[PDB]
Structure formats: structure tokens, C-alpha cells
Symmetry: C2
Subunit: 323 residues, 2 copies
């Protein structure tokens, strides 16, 4: 939290002009760099958007989270595609993926949707799997239940839903705590509605609060990052993950109680100025069978939006761990 950060005063109508420009000119989530291919695939009745590059080499699957789309991974995808098949999927309901109509955005359901698509896109495997933010919510069952097919897994910054997610405090001595948004985002359809009235206002403040390098987030970049979350339908989907967290927690806790910890190499890669050490301690204590297979890296001076803020640190950390 930053007591000194100001919220914007941009009129929502002006912000909508910015979002429209992004969509009309194929910028942001719609901009696919040379070598990358935008595609759609149906899985369990859900139309998923994904972007892929490369061909030979162990495939690497990248799953974004809240405030992001496949786009967050583009710099890393570009770096790796000469040596690896790279695949970045928009989570169900977000980016250019369609919604889960029965509102079951729990880890088990999203993992079922994702693995089916991945098996078709990536092929026989094995593959590497890399996740950030809600990606970590969507993915634990997928990873835990497909070890072998998944040869190594990385979770970034955000905690994996577990018992502690019923504990993170709403308020702290430093102001608003890690826990508060888990509550606001699951509080009826209130966040969807309020944020839909002025997405630029909420997200400009939210995104910068969780950034270490705030200067990276110019109004232009923010317009590109917020456009995919600028409508009620996309916000409803996003907040479905939050509504479903209690389900996700029960599901992951059941997995751990049945012994389904990670027995493949895994990494917690976090930003010191982001969620910082929560995921590192969590994975070490509860999710890894053998600490010797576990790597923890906390990037200094780097906030939650790890590739935006430190693409080089992320690429190097991933390369050192995966390859």
C-alpha cells in the first residue's frame, strides 16, 4: 500500500475512448508480435483464446492472472521461441476466452478446462508449466494431477489457494492488507458493477499499488492493460475466481490431505515489492514433497507485475530453473 499514491481524475468517457482506440488499432491484448500466432480452441464447452510461437523443444505453457491476459508473457515467449514451443492461454472468461456459464471458477473446474486444451495444443509432452496471480488459483489440481506430463512447474507471486486464504488480514499496520481484495471481489456483484463504472480509476490505482516500479505504468500502458477488464462480462468472470476461492481452497486442501504434493521440481518466483514471501513460505511448508526439488527466488525492487517490471529477472530465473 502507498499512502501517497493519488487516484486519477480522468472522465470515464475519456477512458472509454482510450479503451476503444486500443481495441480498434489491435493494440494490447490484440497485438501479436512477429513469430506469434493467435488462436482459439474449445475445451469442455468453453472457447479459449491462446497465443503460440516456436515449434521444437519442450513446450512451455504460460497462464496469466488478474489484471493480465496472455499478453503479460509476450516478452518471455519471444525470448524462448527459437528454442521452445511457447503457449500462453487466456484464463476461462478473461482476455479473449469465453465465460464459464455456471460460474464454477474453482481450481478443479478451471484445471479440467485447461488440461484438455493444453493436451491438444502442446501434444504428448512432457511440458513445463508457468503460472502467475489467478493462474495459481486456476492451476494447482492441473499440476498436482498431471505430474510427469508436467515436468516442472513455476508459480509466481500470488499464493496458491489454501487454508491461509481464509486468514490473510483485510487491514494491517501498513494499511490495506493482502486479504481485503479477496473479500471485495467476492462481495455480491458489487466490484463488477462499481469497477465497470470506471475501470481506469480502479485499475490505475490497483495496478500501481502492487507495482514496485510504478513509472512503467504510463496511462497508455494502463489503457492497454485495463481494456480487457473494461466491461461487466469480463469483470464478472474475473470475480468468479474470487467467488470460487472457498471451493478452490477446499479442493486444494483435499489434494494435500490425500498426499498430492508436488514431487516434480517446482519454483516460487515472487516480487519483493509484490506479495513477496507468502507464496515462498507456503509452497515450502505445504506443497513440496522434497525441499531439494524446490527453488525460491524473490526478485528485489520488483512488484507484482513481474514481467512488466523485471522481464530480464523473470526470464533469467525461469531459464535457470527450467533449462
Amino acid at each position: 500500500y502507498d499512502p501517497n499514491l493519488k487516484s486519477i481524475d480522468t472522465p470515464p468517457a475519456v477512458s472509454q475512448q482510450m479503451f476503444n482506440k486500443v481495441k480498434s488499432n489491435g493494440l494490447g491484448q490484440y497485438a501479436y508480435a512477429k513469430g506469434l500466432s493467435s488462436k482459439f480452441i474449445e475445451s469442455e464447452g468453453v472457447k479459449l483464446h491462446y497465443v503460440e510461437g516456436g515449434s521444437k523443444g519442450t513446450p512451455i505453457v504460460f497462464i496469466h492472472g488478474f489484471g493480465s491476459t496472455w499478453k503479460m508473457w509476450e516478452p518471455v515467449m519471444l525470448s524462448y521461441m527459437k528454442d521452445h514451443k511457447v503457449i500462453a492461454i487466456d484464463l476461462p472468461g478473461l482476455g479473449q476466452s469465453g465465460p464459464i456459464l455456471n460460474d464454477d471458477y474453482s481450481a478443479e473446474n478451471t484445471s479440467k478446462i485447461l488440461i484438455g486444451a493444453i493436451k491438444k495444443i502442446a501434444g504428448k509432452g512432457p511440458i513445463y508449466y508457468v503460472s502467475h496471480d489467478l493462474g495459481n488459483t486456476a492451476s494447482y489440481p492441473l499440476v498436482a494431477n498431471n505430474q510427469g506430463y508436467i515436468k516442472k512447474a513455476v508459480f509466481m507471486d500470488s499464493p496458491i489457494p489454501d487454508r491461509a486464504m481464509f486468514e490473510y488480514p483485510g487491514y494491517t499496520a501498513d494499511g490495506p492488507g493482502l486479504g481485503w481484495h479477496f473479500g471485495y471481489f467476492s462481495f455480491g456483484d458489487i466490484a463488477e458493477k462499481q469497477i465497470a463504472n470506471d475501470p481506469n480509476l480502479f485499475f490505475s490505482y490497483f495496478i500501481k499499488t502492487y507495482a514496485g516500479k510504478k513509472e512503467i505504468f504510463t496511462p497508455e500502458l494502463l489503457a492497454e492493460l485495463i481494456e480487457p477488464y473494461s466491461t461487466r462480462d469480463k469483470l464478472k468472470a474475473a470475480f468468479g475466481y474470487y467467488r470460487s476461492h472457498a471451493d478452490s481452497i477446499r479442493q486444494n486442501e483435499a489434494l494435500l490431505a490425500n498426499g498430492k504434493k508436488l514431487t516434480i521440481p517446482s519454483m516460487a518466483l515472487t516480487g519483493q515489492k509484490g506479495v513477496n514471501d507468502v507464496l515462498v513460505k507456503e509452497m515450502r511448508a505445504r506443497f513440496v514433497a522434497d525441499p531439494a526439488q524446490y527453488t525460491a527466488i524473490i526478485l528485489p525492487d520488483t512488484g507484482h507485475w513481474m514481467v512488466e517490471e523485471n522481464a530480464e529477472g523473470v526470464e533469467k530465473s525461469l531459464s535457470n530453473f527450467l533449462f
Copy 2:
């Protein structure tokens, strides 16, 4: 209690604003005082406070509302007691018809200082009984702790008194959004102020019904009356100042508790089973009371956070038995 099936309204903000305008122009809601009651204002530490009083003889009872409320929440209790008691209900600094704390210091110590000055003038030299609800519990602990004797007995209702545990209440629970989440949202820059000002009826209709046990009571017209007082940025800014100031209030109350300034006068935690429930009951017993023999804890069944709206009988009986 949280109900995942409760629907938010879809009333257009402009239509809601006309509801608010009607409340004000017709003198309803916070502007409506029953026969026997008088609306007055008083300056304390440069802050103009609004209050309503009734009665004359008998131990005075001062009532302090919290978030989502004004003095108005106390009216039925005030009417019930005014025959035998001076009764005084004050709008918290910044809220209802009270003016704001200009330096944004809505910490317990500051609001307690502003309140005690006015109370001494309105209520007289004492002693008095002190009854607090919701943010009243945030505004008032130093007032009560530092003025024991002048305050003969004290009641805190439903909400926790700021202490170290407020740094622990979870944002999320197996039951959905937790007790902690609003403490974060309300102190998250000026975002709550700005978002809620855009459609106060939408936010408060859902918020108020959520924490109600008896939801049917909250008709659109009652909601309009409850929300009108929180329908502008200036009123929301003040409300959320209490939340920005909670870390301060916590330090202040912890310091009082550590300096023995626990409660040595009789005290009561009075809560609603369907509201915050047992948090305050456990908190006061464990940390705020010097002698358990002086402490009463009552949790009203089938009653949510808005305890006088939902169970005036339960509140009056509990206060009467404790106070008298």
C-alpha cells in the same frame, strides 16, 4: 450474515438521487425527529456537531451511532427512555449533520476529545450512561476509559473496539467475504469514496442488507432514508477517515489497555447473532474488563448488525436490565 444469493439493485443512480432529494425536502430520515425530541448543534474543538435530545430528569444516556447510521438509529430507544431519562444522540464528527475533522484525524483519541467536550455541555456534570454502536466503538474507547466515574456504565454494540486483532480479521472466509475486508477497502486510497459516490444506493442497499438478519425490514424507502446521509463525497470521505485512522486508534487503545486503563466500571457487549456476533463479546472479556463480575455479554438471536432496526425490543430489554 453474508448470503451469496442476495441481489444488488439495478435502480439508475439518477432515480436514486431523486429518492435522496425527496428524503431531504420532506424532512424524512435523519431530518425527522419525533415529538419530545429537539435537533440542535454544538461546537466542540472547532467541529460543529449535530445532536438530538429529549427528556430532562434522570441519569442522562448518550448514544453514539456508527457507519451506515446517524443519531436516527437510536430514536425508538430514545423515545422509550425519555420519560425517565435525559437522552442524547450525537452525529459522529463528519457524519450525519455533523461537520468534518479538517485534518483528517479520525483516530479514537481525537474523536473522543471532540465528543467529550460536547457531552459535558449537553449532558451536564454527570454521571451518565454511554451507549455506542459500530464506528461509535472506534470513536469512543479513550472517552470511556479516560472518564470512568463521569461515565457510570458503558455499552458497546456489535462491532469490535479497535485493537491488535483488527490487524488480523480475515478478508475472506469459508462463508464468503470476511469481517476484515471492509477495513481494507475503506482505507484503500480514496477509491471507496469515489466508487460509492457514483452510486450510493447500489453499494449501501447491498451492504446494509448483507449485515442484516431481518432483511425484509429494509424497504427501498427505508434504505433511501439510511443512505441519503452517505450520498455525497464529503460524507463518504469523513466516514472512510475513521477507517484510514484505524491503525492510529489501535495504537491508542492498546496503549490505554497497557497502562491499566481497562474498564473498571460495569460494561456490556451487546451484539447480534447474525451480525458481528461473538467477536466483541470475546474481545471485551479477554482484554477490556478489569473485573469479569462487572461485565455483561448479550448476543441477540436472529438479529443482524442493525440491532435497533431489527430488534428494538431486544436492545431495550438488554440496556434496561444492564443500565437500570
